[PDB]
Amino acid sequence: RIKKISIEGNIAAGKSTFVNILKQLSEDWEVVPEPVARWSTMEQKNGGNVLQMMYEKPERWSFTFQTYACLSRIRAQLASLNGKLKDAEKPVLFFERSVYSDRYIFASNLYESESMNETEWTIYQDWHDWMNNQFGQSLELDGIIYLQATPETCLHRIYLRGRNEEQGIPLEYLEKLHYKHESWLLHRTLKTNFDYLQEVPILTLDVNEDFKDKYESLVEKVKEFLSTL
Amino acid sequence: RIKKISIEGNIAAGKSTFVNILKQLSEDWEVVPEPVARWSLTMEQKNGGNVLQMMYEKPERWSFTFQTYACLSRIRAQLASLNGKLKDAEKPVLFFERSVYSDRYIFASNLYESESMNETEWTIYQDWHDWMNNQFGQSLELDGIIYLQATPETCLHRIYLRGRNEEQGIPLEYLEKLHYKHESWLLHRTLKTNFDYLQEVPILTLDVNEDFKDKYESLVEKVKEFLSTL
Ligand SMILES: CCCc1sc(-c2ccc(OCCO)c(OCCO)c2)nc1CSc1nc(N)cc(N)n1
Ligand SMILES: CCCc1sc(-c2ccc(OCCO)c(OCCO)c2)nc1CSc1nc(N)cc(N)n1
Ligand SMILES: O=c1ccn([C@@H]2O[C@H](COP(=O)(O)OP(=O)(O)O)[C@@H](O)[C@H]2O)c(=O)[nH]1
Ligand SMILES: O=c1ccn([C@@H]2O[C@H](COP(=O)(O)OP(=O)(O)O)[C@@H](O)[C@H]2O)c(=O)[nH]1
C-alpha cells in the first residue's frame, strides 16, 4: 500500500533538490536519500573511504564500491518501508535512485569502461539477482520519475554544488552516464532480468531550466502521474 | 525440524571424506558440500574457478571479492539443501562442510590479519556478513559443530595426496595460522562472536590424525552420542 517511486537522473541533475522539495509538500510523502550521496557511523565511515578509493583508482575499487552502495541502499529502503509513513491515507515513498540504476546504469557502465572484468560483473550480477529475487514484491517499483537533463547542465551543477573531490569529474563520463539513462529510461531499449519493469510507468521531467522557485508545473506532473497508479 | 551440524577443520584435514562417509549411513543424514571445494558448466563454477585462481595469484587484490562470493554461494547452497531434501526423514540431520562462521572467523579474519584485505574491505565484509545472514541466513542457525582436528603436517601430506596443482604451493606456514584460529574458536572458545547463540552451541572435537577411511567406526559413534544430546 505504500507506493514506491524511484527518482533517477545523472550526477547533479537536481534529484536531491527535487525530492527535498517533495518531502515538504505532503505530510503523506517521504524520501529515501542515496547513501553514496550521504557519503559524498560505520557505514558512513566505510562509505567515505571506499568513495575516496573509488575516485583515486576505479579499476581496483569498482566491485567493492558497487556491492557496498547497493547493500547500503537496500537497507535504507527496507528500513523506511518499516520506519516512515505509518498511518497515511495515500502513502508515497520516493527513492533517490534505485537498485536498478545501481546495476543497469552505474555498474554496467563501469564494466563497459573496463573498470570491472567479466568475473567481477557476473559475480556482481549473480549477487544482485539472487538477493533482489528474495524480497518478493516489497522493493518492486510502482513507477519511476526520470529526471532528464544535459551533461553541461549537470557539469555546471557540479561546480555550483562545490564538492571538491567531484571538481575533476569530466564531461565525457557525465556524457556516458546520460546515454545509459536515456537508453534505459527514455527510448526504453534496455531489457533487464527483472519481470515487472516492462509494465512500469515512467515520467520524464526536464530539469535543465532551474526549479528551486518554479516547481509547481513539475510537481503537478508528479501528482498527475501518481493518480494513474 | 532439520538438525544442522557444521563440520569444521583445516585444509585437507578430512572434512569432505568424513562427510561422504556419514551421508551413506542413514537416509536421515545429508550433507552440503562447501562451494569452494567444487570450484577446485554452471556460471557459479566459472566465476568460482576464475576468482579462486585469481585469489591464488593475487590475494591482496582478491580476498574480499573471494570471501564475498564464497559466503554467498554457501548461504545459497545451504538454503537449497534445507528447503529441498529431508521432507520425509523422521530424524533429519544436515551436515554442512564448514559454515558462515568459518568464512568469517577463520578465512576472512586471517586474510585481514595477513593484510590481504584492508581495514575497509574487512569492515565492509563484516557489515555485509552481519546483514546477509540476518536477512537471508537465519534458518541456517546451527545446533552443533564437529571439529576434525589434524596437525598442519597431516594436511600437507593429504594436500599432496589429493594432488591438486594449485594446492601444492600452499605453505605449512598457512596451515599453521588457520590451524591456530580453529583452536581458539572451538577449544579455548577464545573467540568473540557477533552471533551470541554461537558462543553457546555445543562443539564436539575429534582427533583425525590417523587414516580413518578404512576405520571410521569409533568417530561415527562419537557423532551419534552428540546428536542425541542435541
Ligand atoms: C561520486 C559518485 C560515485 C562515483 S565516483 C566515480 C568515478 C570516480 C573516478 C573515476 O575515474 C577516475 C579517473 O578515471 C571514475 O571513472 C570510472 C571509469 O569510467 C568514476 N563514479 C561514480 C559513479 S558510480 C555510482 N554507482 C552507484 N551504484 C551509485 C552512484 N551514485 N554512483
Ligand atoms: C581452498 C583454499 C582456498 C584458498 S586459496 C588461498 C591462498 C592462496 C594463495 C595465497 O598466497 C600465495 C600468493 O601470495 C594465499 O595467501 C593468503 C595471504 O593471507 C592464500 N587461501 C585459501 C583459503 S581462504 C577460504 N575462504 C573461505 N571462505 C572458504 C575457503 N574454503 N577458503
Ligand atoms: O534547479 C536547480 C537544481 C539544482 N541546482 C543545483 O545543482 C546542484 C546539484 O543538484 P543536486 O545536489 O540535487 O544533484 P543530484 O542530487 O541530482 O546529484 C546543487 O548544488 C543545486 O543547488 C540548482 O541550482 N537549481
Ligand atoms: O583419513 C584420511 C583422511 C583424508 N584422506 C585423504 O586426504 C585428502 C584430503 O581429504 P579431504 O579432501 O576429505 O579434506 P578436506 O579438504 O575436505 O578437509 C583426500 O585425498 C583424502 O582421500 C585420507 O587418505 N585419509
Coordinates of C-alpha atoms and ligand atoms in Angstrom, one line a residue:
Chain A
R1 CA 0.0 0.0 0.0
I2 CA 3.0 2.4 0.4
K3 CA 3.8 3.3 -3.2
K4 CA 7.4 3.1 -4.2
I5 CA 8.7 5.6 -6.6
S6 CA 12.3 6.0 -7.8
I7 CA 13.7 9.3 -8.9
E8 CA 16.5 8.7 -11.5
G9 CA 19.0 11.1 -13.1
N10 CA 22.6 11.9 -13.9
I11 CA 25.1 13.2 -11.3
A12 CA 24.0 16.7 -10.3
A13 CA 20.7 16.8 -12.3
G14 CA 19.0 18.0 -9.2
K15 CA 17.5 14.9 -7.7
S16 CA 18.1 15.6 -4.0
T17 CA 16.9 19.2 -4.7
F18 CA 13.7 17.8 -6.2
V19 CA 12.9 15.1 -3.6
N20 CA 13.6 17.6 -0.8
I21 CA 11.0 20.0 -2.3
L22 CA 8.7 17.0 -2.5
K23 CA 9.2 16.0 1.1
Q24 CA 7.9 19.4 2.1
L25 CA 4.6 19.3 0.2
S26 CA 2.9 16.3 1.7
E27 CA 2.9 15.1 5.3
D28 CA 2.0 11.9 3.4
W29 CA 5.2 11.9 1.3
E30 CA 8.7 10.7 2.4
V31 CA 12.1 10.4 0.9
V32 CA 14.9 7.8 0.9
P33 CA 18.1 9.6 0.1
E34 CA 21.0 7.9 -1.7
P35 CA 23.7 6.6 0.6
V36 CA 26.6 7.4 -1.7
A37 CA 25.1 10.9 -1.7
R38 CA 25.3 10.7 2.1
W39 CA 29.0 9.6 1.9
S40 CA 29.7 12.3 -0.7
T41 CA 28.7 5.8 11.5
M42 CA 30.4 2.5 10.4
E43 CA 28.6 2.7 7.0
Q44 CA 29.2 6.5 6.8
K45 CA 32.8 5.7 7.7
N46 CA 33.2 2.8 5.3
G47 CA 31.4 4.7 2.5
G48 CA 33.8 7.7 2.8
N49 CA 37.0 5.7 2.3
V50 CA 35.5 3.5 -0.4
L51 CA 34.2 6.5 -2.2
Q52 CA 37.6 8.2 -2.0
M53 CA 39.3 4.9 -3.0
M54 CA 36.9 4.7 -6.0
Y55 CA 38.0 8.2 -7.2
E56 CA 41.7 7.5 -7.0
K57 CA 41.6 4.1 -8.7
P58 CA 38.2 2.8 -10.0
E59 CA 39.6 -0.3 -11.7
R60 CA 40.6 -1.5 -8.2
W61 CA 37.5 -0.5 -6.1
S62 CA 34.6 -0.6 -8.5
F63 CA 33.4 -4.1 -7.3
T64 CA 33.7 -3.3 -3.7
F65 CA 32.0 0.1 -4.1
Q66 CA 29.1 -1.2 -6.2
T67 CA 28.4 -4.0 -3.7
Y68 CA 28.6 -1.6 -0.8
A69 CA 26.5 1.1 -2.4
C70 CA 23.8 -1.4 -3.2
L71 CA 23.7 -3.1 0.2
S72 CA 23.6 0.4 1.9
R73 CA 20.7 1.4 -0.4
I74 CA 18.8 -1.9 0.1
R75 CA 18.9 -1.5 3.9
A76 CA 17.9 2.2 3.8
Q77 CA 15.0 1.4 1.5
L78 CA 13.9 -1.7 3.6
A79 CA 14.2 0.4 6.7
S80 CA 11.9 3.2 5.5
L81 CA 9.2 0.8 4.5
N82 CA 9.2 -0.4 8.1
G83 CA 10.0 3.0 9.6
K84 CA 8.4 6.0 7.8
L85 CA 4.8 6.9 6.8
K86 CA 3.0 4.6 9.1
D87 CA -0.7 5.6 9.1
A88 CA -1.1 7.6 5.9
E89 CA -4.1 7.7 3.7
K90 CA -2.2 7.9 0.4
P91 CA 1.4 6.8 1.3
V92 CA 4.3 7.6 -1.2
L93 CA 8.0 6.9 -0.5
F94 CA 10.3 8.5 -3.1
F95 CA 13.7 6.8 -3.6
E96 CA 16.7 8.8 -4.5
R97 CA 17.8 6.3 -7.2
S98 CA 17.3 2.5 -7.2
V99 CA 18.7 -1.0 -7.1
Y100 CA 18.1 -1.0 -10.9
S101 CA 20.1 2.2 -11.5
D102 CA 22.8 0.7 -9.2
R103 CA 23.2 -2.2 -11.6
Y104 CA 21.9 -1.3 -15.2
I105 CA 23.3 2.2 -15.3
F106 CA 26.3 2.6 -13.0
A107 CA 27.7 -1.0 -12.6
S108 CA 27.0 -1.8 -16.3
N109 CA 28.9 1.4 -17.3
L110 CA 31.9 0.6 -15.1
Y111 CA 32.1 -2.8 -16.8
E112 CA 32.0 -1.2 -20.2
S113 CA 34.8 1.2 -19.3
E114 CA 36.8 -1.9 -18.2
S115 CA 36.9 -0.9 -14.5
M116 CA 35.4 -4.4 -13.8
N117 CA 36.5 -7.6 -15.5
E118 CA 33.9 -10.2 -16.6
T119 CA 34.3 -12.3 -13.4
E120 CA 33.6 -9.1 -11.4
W121 CA 30.5 -8.2 -13.5
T122 CA 28.8 -11.7 -13.3
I123 CA 29.7 -12.1 -9.6
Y124 CA 28.0 -8.7 -9.0
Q125 CA 25.0 -9.6 -11.2
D126 CA 24.7 -13.0 -9.6
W127 CA 24.7 -11.4 -6.2
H128 CA 22.4 -8.6 -7.2
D129 CA 19.9 -11.1 -8.7
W130 CA 19.7 -13.8 -6.0
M131 CA 19.1 -11.2 -3.4
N132 CA 16.7 -8.9 -5.5
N133 CA 14.7 -12.0 -6.0
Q134 CA 14.4 -12.6 -2.3
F135 CA 12.1 -9.7 -1.4
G136 CA 9.0 -10.8 -3.3
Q137 CA 7.3 -7.6 -4.3
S138 CA 8.5 -5.5 -1.4
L139 CA 11.0 -3.2 -3.1
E140 CA 9.5 -3.6 -6.6
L141 CA 8.6 -0.1 -8.1
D142 CA 5.1 1.3 -8.7
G143 CA 6.7 3.8 -11.0
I144 CA 9.7 5.8 -12.0
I145 CA 10.4 9.5 -12.3
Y146 CA 13.2 10.1 -14.8
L147 CA 14.8 13.5 -14.2
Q148 CA 16.1 14.2 -17.8
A149 CA 18.8 16.8 -18.3
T150 CA 22.0 17.6 -20.4
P151 CA 25.6 16.9 -19.3
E152 CA 26.7 20.6 -19.4
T153 CA 23.8 21.5 -17.2
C154 CA 25.0 18.6 -14.9
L155 CA 28.6 19.7 -15.3
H156 CA 27.6 23.2 -14.4
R157 CA 25.7 21.9 -11.4
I158 CA 28.9 20.0 -10.1
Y159 CA 30.8 23.3 -9.8
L160 CA 28.0 25.2 -8.2
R161 CA 27.5 22.3 -5.7
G162 CA 31.1 22.6 -4.8
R163 CA 32.2 19.1 -3.6
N164 CA 35.9 19.5 -4.3
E165 CA 36.5 15.7 -4.7
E166 CA 34.0 15.9 -7.6
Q167 CA 35.5 19.0 -9.3
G168 CA 37.5 16.7 -11.6
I169 CA 34.6 14.7 -13.0
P170 CA 34.9 15.3 -16.7
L171 CA 32.2 16.0 -19.3
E172 CA 32.6 12.6 -21.1
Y173 CA 31.9 10.5 -18.1
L174 CA 28.7 12.5 -17.4
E175 CA 28.1 12.1 -21.2
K176 CA 28.4 8.3 -20.8
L177 CA 26.0 8.2 -17.9
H178 CA 23.4 10.1 -19.9
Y179 CA 23.2 7.8 -22.9
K180 CA 22.8 4.9 -20.4
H181 CA 19.9 6.9 -18.6
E182 CA 18.4 7.8 -22.0
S183 CA 18.8 4.3 -23.3
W184 CA 17.1 2.7 -20.3
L185 CA 14.5 5.4 -19.3
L186 CA 13.7 7.4 -22.5
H187 CA 13.9 5.2 -25.6
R188 CA 13.2 2.2 -23.3
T189 CA 15.5 -0.1 -25.2
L190 CA 17.3 -2.0 -22.3
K191 CA 15.7 -5.2 -21.0
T192 CA 16.8 -6.1 -17.5
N193 CA 16.5 -9.5 -15.9
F194 CA 13.5 -8.2 -13.8
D195 CA 10.0 -9.2 -14.9
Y196 CA 7.6 -6.3 -13.9
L197 CA 9.9 -3.4 -15.1
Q198 CA 8.4 -3.8 -18.6
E199 CA 5.0 -2.7 -17.2
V200 CA 6.4 0.2 -15.1
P201 CA 5.3 3.7 -15.8
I202 CA 7.8 6.4 -16.4
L203 CA 7.5 10.2 -16.0
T204 CA 10.3 12.2 -17.6
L205 CA 10.8 15.8 -16.4
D206 CA 13.0 18.5 -17.9
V207 CA 15.3 19.9 -15.2
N208 CA 17.6 22.0 -17.4
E209 CA 15.6 25.1 -16.6
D210 CA 16.3 26.0 -12.8
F211 CA 13.5 24.9 -10.4
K212 CA 14.2 25.8 -6.8
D213 CA 11.5 28.6 -7.1
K214 CA 9.5 27.3 -10.1
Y215 CA 8.5 23.7 -9.5
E216 CA 4.7 23.8 -9.5
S217 CA 4.4 22.5 -13.0
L218 CA 6.9 19.7 -12.4
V219 CA 5.0 18.7 -9.2
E220 CA 1.7 18.9 -11.0
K221 CA 3.1 16.3 -13.3
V222 CA 4.1 14.1 -10.3
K223 CA 0.6 14.2 -8.8
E224 CA -1.0 13.7 -12.2
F225 CA 1.3 10.7 -12.7
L226 CA 0.7 9.4 -9.2
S227 CA -3.1 9.2 -9.8
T228 CA -2.6 6.8 -12.8
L229 CA -1.2 4.2 -10.3
Chain B
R1 CA 13.0 -29.8 12.3
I2 CA 16.1 -30.5 10.3
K3 CA 19.2 -30.6 12.5
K4 CA 22.2 -28.6 11.3
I5 CA 25.7 -29.7 12.3
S6 CA 28.8 -27.9 10.9
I7 CA 31.8 -30.0 10.0
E8 CA 34.9 -27.8 10.7
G9 CA 38.6 -28.1 10.2
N10 CA 41.7 -27.2 8.2
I11 CA 42.5 -27.6 4.5
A12 CA 42.7 -31.4 3.9
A13 CA 42.1 -32.5 7.5
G14 CA 39.4 -34.9 6.0
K15 CA 36.1 -33.0 6.0
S16 CA 35.0 -34.0 2.5
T17 CA 35.9 -37.6 3.3
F18 CA 34.1 -37.9 6.6
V19 CA 31.0 -36.1 5.2
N20 CA 30.9 -38.7 2.4
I21 CA 31.2 -41.5 5.0
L22 CA 28.4 -40.1 7.2
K23 CA 25.9 -39.4 4.4
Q24 CA 25.7 -43.2 3.4
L25 CA 25.0 -44.4 7.0
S26 CA 21.4 -43.2 7.1
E27 CA 18.5 -41.8 4.9
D28 CA 18.0 -39.2 7.6
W29 CA 21.6 -37.8 7.0
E30 CA 22.6 -35.5 4.2
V31 CA 25.4 -33.1 3.5
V32 CA 26.0 -29.7 1.9
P33 CA 29.5 -29.7 0.3
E34 CA 31.3 -26.3 0.6
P35 CA 31.2 -24.2 -2.6
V36 CA 35.0 -23.5 -2.6
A37 CA 35.9 -27.2 -2.9
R38 CA 33.8 -27.7 -6.0
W39 CA 35.5 -24.6 -7.6
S40 CA 38.7 -26.7 -7.2
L41 CA 29.0 -25.7 -16.7
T42 CA 27.2 -23.6 -14.0
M43 CA 28.1 -20.0 -14.2
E44 CA 28.8 -20.1 -10.4
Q45 CA 31.6 -22.6 -11.2
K46 CA 33.0 -20.4 -13.9
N47 CA 33.1 -17.4 -11.6
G48 CA 34.3 -19.8 -8.8
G49 CA 37.1 -21.4 -10.8
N50 CA 38.0 -17.9 -12.0
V51 CA 38.2 -16.0 -8.8
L52 CA 39.8 -18.8 -6.9
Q53 CA 42.6 -18.9 -9.4
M54 CA 42.9 -15.0 -9.1
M55 CA 43.0 -15.4 -5.3
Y56 CA 45.9 -17.9 -5.7
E57 CA 47.8 -15.4 -7.9
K58 CA 47.0 -12.2 -6.1
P59 CA 45.3 -12.5 -2.6
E60 CA 45.9 -8.8 -1.6
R61 CA 43.8 -7.8 -4.6
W62 CA 41.2 -10.6 -4.5
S63 CA 40.3 -11.8 -1.0
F64 CA 37.3 -9.6 -0.3
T65 CA 35.8 -10.5 -3.6
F66 CA 36.6 -14.1 -3.0
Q67 CA 35.3 -14.1 0.6
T68 CA 32.1 -12.4 -0.5
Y69 CA 31.3 -14.9 -3.3
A70 CA 32.2 -18.0 -1.3
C71 CA 30.0 -17.0 1.6
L72 CA 27.1 -16.1 -0.7
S73 CA 27.4 -19.4 -2.5
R74 CA 27.5 -21.2 0.8
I75 CA 24.3 -19.5 2.2
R76 CA 22.6 -20.1 -1.1
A77 CA 23.6 -23.7 -1.3
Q78 CA 22.7 -24.5 2.4
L79 CA 19.2 -23.0 1.8
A80 CA 18.7 -25.1 -1.4
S81 CA 19.5 -28.2 0.8
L82 CA 17.4 -27.2 3.9
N83 CA 14.3 -26.3 1.9
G84 CA 14.9 -29.1 -0.6
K85 CA 15.5 -32.6 0.9
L86 CA 14.7 -34.3 4.3
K87 CA 10.9 -33.7 4.0
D88 CA 10.2 -37.4 4.8
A89 CA 13.1 -38.2 7.3
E90 CA 12.0 -38.9 10.8
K91 CA 15.4 -37.9 12.3
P92 CA 16.7 -35.4 9.8
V93 CA 20.3 -34.2 10.1
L94 CA 22.0 -31.8 7.7
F95 CA 25.9 -31.8 7.9
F96 CA 27.4 -28.6 6.4
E97 CA 31.0 -28.7 5.2
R98 CA 32.2 -25.5 7.1
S99 CA 29.9 -22.5 7.9
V100 CA 29.4 -18.8 7.5
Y101 CA 31.4 -18.5 10.8
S102 CA 34.3 -20.4 9.2
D103 CA 34.2 -18.0 6.3
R104 CA 34.5 -15.0 8.6
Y105 CA 36.4 -16.0 11.7
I106 CA 39.0 -18.3 10.1
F107 CA 39.5 -17.3 6.5
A108 CA 38.4 -13.6 6.2
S109 CA 39.9 -12.7 9.6
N110 CA 43.2 -14.5 8.6
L111 CA 43.2 -12.6 5.3
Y112 CA 42.6 -9.4 7.2
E113 CA 45.3 -10.3 9.8
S114 CA 47.7 -11.2 6.9
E115 CA 47.0 -7.8 5.2
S116 CA 45.4 -9.4 2.1
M117 CA 42.2 -7.4 2.9
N118 CA 42.5 -3.8 4.2
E119 CA 40.6 -2.3 7.2
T120 CA 37.8 -1.0 4.9
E121 CA 37.5 -4.2 2.9
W122 CA 37.3 -6.2 6.1
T123 CA 34.9 -3.7 7.8
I124 CA 32.7 -3.7 4.7
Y125 CA 32.7 -7.5 4.7
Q126 CA 31.8 -7.7 8.3
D127 CA 28.9 -5.3 7.8
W128 CA 27.9 -7.3 4.7
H129 CA 28.2 -10.6 6.7
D130 CA 26.2 -9.3 9.7
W131 CA 23.3 -8.4 7.4
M132 CA 23.4 -11.1 4.8
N133 CA 22.9 -13.8 7.4
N134 CA 20.2 -11.9 9.1
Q135 CA 18.1 -11.0 6.1
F136 CA 18.5 -14.5 4.5
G137 CA 20.6 -16.8 6.7
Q138 CA 18.6 -17.1 9.8
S139 CA 17.2 -20.6 9.5
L140 CA 20.8 -21.7 8.8
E141 CA 21.4 -21.4 12.6
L142 CA 23.5 -24.4 13.8
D143 CA 22.7 -26.9 16.6
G144 CA 26.3 -28.3 16.7
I145 CA 29.8 -28.2 15.4
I146 CA 32.2 -31.2 14.7
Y147 CA 35.9 -30.3 14.6
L148 CA 38.1 -32.7 12.7
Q149 CA 41.5 -32.0 14.2
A150 CA 44.6 -32.6 12.1
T151 CA 48.0 -31.2 12.5
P152 CA 49.4 -28.7 10.0
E153 CA 51.7 -31.6 9.0
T154 CA 48.8 -34.1 8.3
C155 CA 47.2 -31.7 5.8
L156 CA 50.2 -31.0 3.6
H157 CA 50.7 -34.7 3.0
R158 CA 47.0 -35.0 2.5
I159 CA 47.1 -32.0 0.3
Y160 CA 49.8 -33.8 -1.6
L161 CA 47.7 -37.0 -1.5
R162 CA 44.7 -35.2 -3.1
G163 CA 47.2 -33.8 -5.6
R164 CA 45.5 -30.6 -6.9
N165 CA 48.1 -28.5 -8.7
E166 CA 47.1 -25.2 -7.1
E167 CA 47.2 -26.6 -3.6
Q168 CA 50.8 -28.0 -3.7
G169 CA 52.2 -24.4 -3.5
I170 CA 50.3 -23.8 -0.2
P171 CA 52.9 -23.4 2.6
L172 CA 53.0 -25.2 6.0
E173 CA 53.0 -21.6 7.3
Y174 CA 49.5 -21.0 6.0
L175 CA 48.2 -24.3 7.6
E176 CA 49.8 -23.1 10.8
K177 CA 47.8 -19.8 11.2
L178 CA 44.4 -21.3 10.1
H179 CA 45.4 -24.3 12.3
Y180 CA 45.8 -21.7 15.2
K181 CA 42.5 -19.9 14.7
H182 CA 40.4 -23.1 14.7
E183 CA 41.6 -24.0 18.3
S184 CA 40.8 -20.6 19.8
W185 CA 37.3 -20.6 18.2
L186 CA 36.4 -24.2 19.1
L187 CA 38.6 -25.4 22.0
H188 CA 39.5 -22.5 24.3
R189 CA 36.4 -20.7 23.0
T190 CA 38.5 -17.6 23.0
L191 CA 36.6 -16.1 20.0
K192 CA 34.3 -13.1 20.5
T193 CA 31.5 -13.5 18.0
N194 CA 28.7 -11.2 16.9
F195 CA 26.3 -14.2 16.9
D196 CA 25.8 -14.7 20.7
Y197 CA 23.9 -18.0 20.2
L198 CA 27.2 -19.2 18.7
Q199 CA 29.2 -18.9 22.0
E200 CA 26.5 -21.4 23.5
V201 CA 26.4 -24.0 20.7
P202 CA 27.7 -27.5 21.7
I203 CA 31.0 -28.4 20.0
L204 CA 32.5 -31.9 19.5
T205 CA 36.2 -32.3 18.9
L206 CA 37.6 -35.3 17.1
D207 CA 41.2 -36.1 16.5
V208 CA 41.6 -37.3 12.9
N209 CA 45.3 -37.7 12.7
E210 CA 45.2 -41.4 11.5
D211 CA 43.9 -42.6 8.2
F212 CA 40.2 -43.1 9.3
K213 CA 39.0 -44.1 5.9
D214 CA 39.0 -47.9 6.4
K215 CA 38.4 -47.5 10.1
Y216 CA 35.9 -44.8 10.9
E217 CA 33.5 -46.6 13.3
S218 CA 34.6 -45.0 16.6
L219 CA 34.4 -41.5 15.1
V220 CA 30.9 -42.3 13.9
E221 CA 30.0 -43.5 17.4
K222 CA 31.2 -40.1 18.9
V223 CA 29.0 -38.3 16.4
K224 CA 26.0 -40.4 17.3
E225 CA 26.2 -39.7 21.1
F226 CA 26.5 -36.0 20.3
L227 CA 23.3 -36.0 18.0
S228 CA 21.1 -37.3 20.8
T229 CA 22.3 -34.7 23.3
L230 CA 21.1 -32.2 20.7
Ligands
LIG1 C1 30.7 10.3 -6.5 C2 29.7 9.4 -7.2 C3 30.3 8.0 -7.2 C4 31.2 7.8 -8.3 S1 32.9 8.1 -8.3 C5 33.1 7.6 -9.8 C6 34.2 7.6 -10.5 C7 35.3 8.3 -10.0 C8 36.5 8.4 -10.7 C9 36.6 7.8 -11.9 O1 37.7 7.8 -12.7 C10 39.0 8.2 -12.1 C11 39.8 8.7 -13.3 O2 39.3 7.9 -14.5 C12 35.6 7.1 -12.5 O3 35.8 6.6 -13.7 C13 35.3 5.3 -14.0 C14 35.8 5.0 -15.4 O4 34.7 5.0 -16.3 C15 34.3 7.0 -11.8 N1 32.0 7.3 -10.4 C16 30.9 7.4 -9.5 C17 29.6 7.0 -10.0 S2 29.4 5.2 -9.8 C18 27.9 5.0 -8.8 N2 27.4 3.8 -8.6 C19 26.3 3.7 -7.8 N3 25.7 2.5 -7.7 C20 25.7 4.8 -7.3 C21 26.3 6.1 -7.6 N4 25.8 7.2 -7.2 N5 27.4 6.1 -8.3
LIG2 C1 40.9 -24.0 -0.9 C2 41.7 -22.8 -0.4 C3 41.2 -21.5 -1.0 C4 42.3 -20.6 -0.6 S1 43.5 -20.2 -1.7 C5 44.3 -19.3 -0.6 C6 45.5 -18.7 -0.8 C7 46.3 -18.9 -2.0 C8 47.5 -18.3 -2.2 C9 48.0 -17.4 -1.3 O1 49.1 -16.8 -1.4 C10 50.1 -17.2 -2.3 C11 50.3 -15.9 -3.1 O2 50.9 -14.9 -2.3 C12 47.2 -17.2 -0.1 O3 47.8 -16.3 0.8 C13 46.8 -15.6 1.6 C14 47.5 -14.4 2.2 O4 46.9 -14.1 3.5 C15 46.0 -17.8 0.1 N1 43.7 -19.4 0.5 C16 42.6 -20.1 0.6 C17 41.8 -20.2 1.8 S2 40.5 -18.8 2.0 C18 39.0 -19.6 2.1 N2 37.9 -18.8 2.4 C19 36.7 -19.3 2.5 N3 35.7 -18.5 2.9 C20 36.5 -20.7 2.3 C21 37.6 -21.4 2.0 N4 37.5 -22.7 1.7 N5 38.8 -20.9 1.9
LIG3 O1 17.0 23.8 -10.1 C1 18.2 23.6 -9.7 C2 18.6 22.3 -9.5 C3 19.9 22.1 -9.0 N1 20.7 23.1 -8.8 C4 22.0 22.9 -8.2 O2 22.6 21.8 -8.8 C5 23.4 21.1 -7.8 C6 23.2 19.6 -7.9 O3 21.9 19.3 -7.5 P1 21.6 18.0 -6.6 O4 22.6 18.1 -5.4 O5 20.1 17.9 -6.3 O6 22.0 16.9 -7.6 P2 21.7 15.3 -7.7 O7 21.0 15.1 -6.4 O8 20.9 15.0 -8.9 O9 23.1 14.8 -7.8 C7 23.0 21.7 -6.5 O10 24.1 22.5 -5.9 C8 21.8 22.5 -6.7 O11 21.7 23.6 -5.9 C9 20.2 24.4 -9.0 O12 21.0 25.4 -8.7 N2 19.0 24.6 -9.4
LIG4 O1 41.8 -40.4 6.8 C1 42.0 -39.8 5.7 C2 41.6 -38.5 5.5 C3 41.8 -37.9 4.3 N1 42.5 -38.6 3.3 C4 42.8 -38.0 2.0 O2 43.3 -36.7 2.2 C5 42.9 -35.9 1.2 C6 42.2 -34.7 1.9 O3 41.0 -35.1 2.5 P1 39.6 -34.3 2.3 O4 39.6 -33.9 0.8 O5 38.5 -35.1 2.9 O6 39.9 -33.0 3.2 P2 39.0 -31.6 3.3 O7 39.7 -30.7 2.4 O8 37.7 -32.0 2.9 O9 39.1 -31.4 4.8 C7 42.0 -36.7 0.2 O10 42.6 -37.2 -1.0 C8 41.6 -37.9 1.1 O11 41.3 -39.0 0.3 C9 42.9 -39.9 3.6 O12 43.5 -40.6 2.7 N2 42.6 -40.5 4.8

